[PDB]
Amino acid sequence: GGKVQIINKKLDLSNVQSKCGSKDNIKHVPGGGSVQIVYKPVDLSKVTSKCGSLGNIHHKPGGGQVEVKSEKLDFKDRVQSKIGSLDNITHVPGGGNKKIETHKLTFR
Amino acid sequence: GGKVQIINKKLDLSNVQSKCGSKDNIKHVPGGGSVQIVYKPVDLSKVTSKCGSLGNIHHKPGGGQVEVKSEKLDFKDRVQSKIGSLDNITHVPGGGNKKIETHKLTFR
Amino acid sequence: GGKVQIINKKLDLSNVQSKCGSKDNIKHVPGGGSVQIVYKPVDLSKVTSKCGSLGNIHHKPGGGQVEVKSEKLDFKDRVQSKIGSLDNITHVPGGGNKKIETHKLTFR
Amino acid sequence: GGKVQIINKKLDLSNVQSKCGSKDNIKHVPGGGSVQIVYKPVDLSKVTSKCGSLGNIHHKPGGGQVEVKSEKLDFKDRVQSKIGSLDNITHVPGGGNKKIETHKLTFR
Amino acid sequence: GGKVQIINKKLDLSNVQSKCGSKDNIKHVPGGGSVQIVYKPVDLSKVTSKCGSLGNIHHKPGGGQVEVKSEKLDFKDRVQSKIGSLDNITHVPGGGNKKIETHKLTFR
């Protein structure tokens, strides 16, 4: 028999803002010969702006209802190999250099 | 029989702002020959702005209801290999250098 | 039979602001030949701005309801390999250097 | 039968601000040939600004309700390999140097 | 039957500010050939600004309700390998040096 009464009269709301930055993986790479790896970028963000808003309204006297709201994420990883491997690289941004040598003699 | 009464009269709200910075993994890399790895960037942030807003309204006298709200994240990792391995690299940004040598003699 | 009465009259609220900085993993790297690894950056932050807002309203006399709100994160890691390994590297930003030598003679 | 009465009349609130700094892992690295590793940066911060806001309102006389709000984070780590290993490196930012030598003779 | 009455009349609040500094792991590293490791930076800070705000309102005469609010963090670590190991390194920022030698003769 209880009464839940909400009265709103003459409400003036304004200027509700929310801002988020950029999310770039690889961007503005003038260099070369590099190894850049972005592995599993998982995002569950939320940028929300609520102005005079109400949530769910429930009127369940003696209900007994079962409500389940679940979010499951399963992305377990098991690495058995090299992710980023760079070898035998000569990188000379300069000029006029002489006799730049790299060697890799593997006798298995 | 209890009464929950809320009265709002002549409310003036303004200038509700929320800001967040950028989230960049790899950006502005003029260099070369490097190994850059971003592994599993997981984000669950939330930038919210509430202005005169109300949450969920529940009227459940003697309900007995079961409500479950769960969030499960399972991304366990098991690494059995090199993530970032750089070897046998010559990096000469300068100029005029002479006789730059690198050697790797592995006799297995 | 108890009454919960809240009365708000002639409320003037303004200038509610919240700011957060940027979250960059790898950014502005002019150098080369380096190994940069960002491993599992997990974020659960929240930047919120509340202005004259109310939470959940519950009217449950003698309810007995069971409410569960859980957040579970399981990302245990078990490393059995090198994450960042740099070897046999010559890095000469200068100029005019002569006879720069690196050697690695492994006889297994 | 008890009454919880709250009356707010002619309230003027303003200038509610909260600021947080940037959270950068790797940024502004002009050097090269280095090993930089950021391992599991976990963030659970919260920058909030509340202006004339109210929390959850509960009216549960003789309820007996069970409410559980839990947050569990399990990311135990067990390292069995080198995280950052740099060897056999020549780094000469200067100029005019002569006969710079590095050697590693491992006879296993 | 007890009454909890709170009356607020003609309240003028202003200039509520809270500031926090930046939290950077690795930043502004012009040097090279170094090993920089930031291991498990865990943050649970909170920068809050409350201006004329009220907390949760509870009206539970003879309730017997069980409320649990727990936060559990378990990230125990067990290291069985070198975290940062730098060896066989020549670092000469100067110029004009002659006959700089490094040797490592391991006969296992």
UniProtKB/Swiss-Prot annotation, chains A, B, C, D, E:
Modified residues (N6,N6-dimethyllysine): 40
Origin: domain of life: Eukaryota
Residues that carry a glycan: 9-10, 76, 82, 98
Sites bearing Phosphoserine, chain numbering: 14, 22, 34, 53, 81, 85
Tissues in which the UniProt entry reports expression: Expressed in neurons. Isoform PNS-tau is expressed in the peripheral nervous system while the others are expressed in the central nervous system.
Residues annotated with Omega-N-methylarginine modification: 78
Positions carrying Deamidated asparagine: 8
Tau/MAP repeat intervals: 4-34, 35-65, 66-97
Post-translational modification: Phosphorylation at serine and threonine residues in S-P or T-P motifs by proline-directed protein kinases (PDPK1, CDK1, CDK5, GSK3, MAPK) (only 2-3 sites per protein in interphase, seven-fold increase in mitosis, and in the form associated with paired helical filaments (PHF-tau)), and at serine residues in K-X-G-S motifs by MAP/microtubule affinity-regulating kinase (MARK1, MARK2, MARK3 or MARK4), causing detachment from microtubules, and their disassembly. Phosphorylation decreases with age.
Covalent cross-link Glycyl lysine isopeptide (Lys-Gly) (interchain with G-Cter in ubiquitin), where: 10, 27, 40, 46, 50, 60, 72, 76, 82, 98, 104
Region Microtubule-binding domain, annotated ranges: 1-97
Disulfide cross-links: 20-51
Localization of this protein: Cytoplasm, Cytosol; Cell membrane; Cytoplasm, Cytoskeleton; Cell projection, Axon
Effect of residue 25 to H: In FTD1; reduced the ability of tau to promote microtubule assembly without having a significant effect on tau filament formation; effects at both the RNA and the protein level
Annotated positions of the N6-acetyllysine modification: 10, 19, 27, 40, 46, 50, 60, 72, 76, 98
Function of the molecule: Promotes microtubule assembly and stability, and might be involved in the establishment and maintenance of neuronal polarity. The C-terminus binds axonal microtubules while the N-terminus binds neural plasma membrane components, suggesting that tau functions as a linker protein between both. Axonal polarity is predetermined by TAU/MAPT localization (in the neuronal cell) in the domain of the cell body defined by the centrosome. The short isoforms allow plasticity of the cytoskeleton whereas the longer isoforms may preferentially play a role in its stabilization.
Quaternary structure note: Interacts with MARK1, MARK2, MARK3 and MARK4. Interacts with PSMC2 through SQSTM1. Interacts with SQSTM1 when polyubiquitinated. Interacts with FKBP4. Binds to CSNK1D. Interacts with SGK1. Interacts with PIN1. Interacts with LRRK2. Interacts with LRP1, leading to endocytosis; this interaction is reduced in the presence of LRPAP1/RAP.
Domain remark from Swiss-Prot or TrEMBL: The tau/MAP repeat binds to tubulin. Type I isoforms contain 3 repeats while type II isoforms contain 4 repeats.
Disease in which the protein is involved: In Alzheimer disease, the neuronal cytoskeleton in the brain is progressively disrupted and replaced by tangles of paired helical filaments (PHF) and straight filaments, mainly composed of hyperphosphorylated forms of TAU (PHF-TAU or AD P-TAU). O-GlcNAcylation is greatly reduced in Alzheimer disease brain cerebral cortex leading to an increase in TAU/MAPT phosphorylations. Frontotemporal dementia 1: A form of dementia characterized by pathologic finding of frontotemporal lobar degeneration, presenile dementia with behavioral changes, deterioration of cognitive capacities and loss of memory. In some cases, parkinsonian symptoms are prominent. Neuropathological changes include frontotemporal atrophy often associated with atrophy of the basal ganglia, substantia nigra, amygdala. In most cases, protein tau deposits are found in glial cells and/or neurons.
Protein's UniProt name: Microtubule-associated protein tau
Natural source organism: Homo sapiens
